[PDB]
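Minutes, project huddle
Topic: does the predicted pose make sense with magnesium ion bound?
PN asked that the exact inputs be recorded in the minutes so nobody has to dig through chat later. Recorded below.
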Amino acid sequence: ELMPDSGAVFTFGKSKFAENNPGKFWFKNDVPVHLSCGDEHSAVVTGNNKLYMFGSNNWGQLGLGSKSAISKPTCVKALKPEKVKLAACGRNHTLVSTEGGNVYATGGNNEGQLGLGDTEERNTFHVISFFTSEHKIKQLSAGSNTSAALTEDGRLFMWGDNSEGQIGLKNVSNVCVPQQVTIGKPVSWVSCGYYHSAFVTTDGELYVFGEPENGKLGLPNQLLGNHRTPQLVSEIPEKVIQVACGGEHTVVLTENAVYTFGLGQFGQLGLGTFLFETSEPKVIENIRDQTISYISCGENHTALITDIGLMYTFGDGRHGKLGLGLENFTNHFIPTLCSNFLRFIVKLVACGGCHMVVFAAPHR
Amino acid sequence: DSDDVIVPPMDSEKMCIEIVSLAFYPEAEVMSDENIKQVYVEYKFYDLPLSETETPVSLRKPRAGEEIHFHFSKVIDLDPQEQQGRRRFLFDMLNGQDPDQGHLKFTVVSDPLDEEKKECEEVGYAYLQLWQILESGRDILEQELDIVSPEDLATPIGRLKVSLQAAAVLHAIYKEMTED
Ligand SMILES: [Mg+2]
Ligand SMILES: [Mg+2]
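Predicted holo structure (tokens), as shared on screen:
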């Protein structure tokens, strides 16, 4: 009835919820704790360790045992006996991690991204039996036919499509079970974009790999030949903390600044209305006065949450997916404050292909 | 259940117009004119203020082979009884009755860096024929229109992509206004 003090989940764009108008929902005596969004679907993990799925399901990516789109966030009841902790949503698949030590996947599998040892699609969650309780999963990520799981002790495993080097496995075309992708240093963050990926090491270095097009690997030209192995982006001098990868762009959070690179024809690099591409990292000068605590990318837009719970978005405005709440949509070329959320603290965000999902709590 | 999420409570009677993107031919005069640095696109719909039907941002003039992307979308209410005058404006247009002879005209305008209206210049026009949507019975996404020079209204200088969701409503308007 009344929106709880702990807040609500707001959906923007074509999320398949509330007929693609700005939607809102919450849970009875429970709260979201993790959001993820893929190209056309979304996952919410709750504080009581339940998983709720919604969006397109034409590949079985919701894990709900059919292939028809689902309008409403729907609990994956099959997983109720386990404590779901994380999910990631790729283009047509979903990964889930549980506290007991199991990782499961569902959806499209044409390049082996489910990690099940074959390439047959699934429409319910299947276990990836490589992972056990000795893999304490810190983060999951999933791009277009690609998957990643990062452990607390800093090991990174990736699987699915390597057709452009995007899981960092050199000349192998794809793998159907997890493989450790190591450059010999512990990893603290990973992001699978559509056709490229990146990770950040615990000592603050950024490595990028995958399709060497549109500037999005952020590397000087002489290194683009080696795009199938993770390579250091040395042009960022200070310690990197996060990375998020989109369709044709990458966004990087350092202690000092936010940097972007790749192609931003719709504004998603946030570098203004004259510069739409950069093959080397450039600082978003525009928000240098805010402390950014969290970065997120969809296929063609970008979201930033500040340390006080303000959110700024930029890039492709179609369907209202920028989360700005205007009735007339438009591309935005610099970070723009979601002033529709000024009476809230924004706590989590995930960005998808045509949509975005926000968890925000009212000031009162 | 209470695996239940709580959802609080919350047309062929509307048209949506999107100005998607544009490109210029390299030989067009606008491409060699150094004074023309950035452009926006507008149209005028019945009595809506022009400020509501211009792309809210101006973008750098494209280089050869480049497109710029506005994605500016506007939903226009055409409720059968509150929006009579807008519906009749559209009817006259379908019958080729307006100044532009049955076309919705988009204007591409050069915006000085200082944004002074008195130095804006119309760079070209693109015309969209409404009757075609009525006849075809459907909406084309990223329909590409020639942008034509203001000098003769005929020589192409570029291409403008637009998407209208309008077939359902033009069809309801045509029905209503010929016999109701
Ligand atoms: Mg360059
Ligand atoms: Mg898309």
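Observations noted during the meeting:
- The pocket of magnesium ion (ligand 2) is lined by residues A 299, 353-354 (CB under 6 Å).
- Chain B touches chain A through 27 residues (CB under 8 Å).
No decisions taken; revisit at the next huddle.
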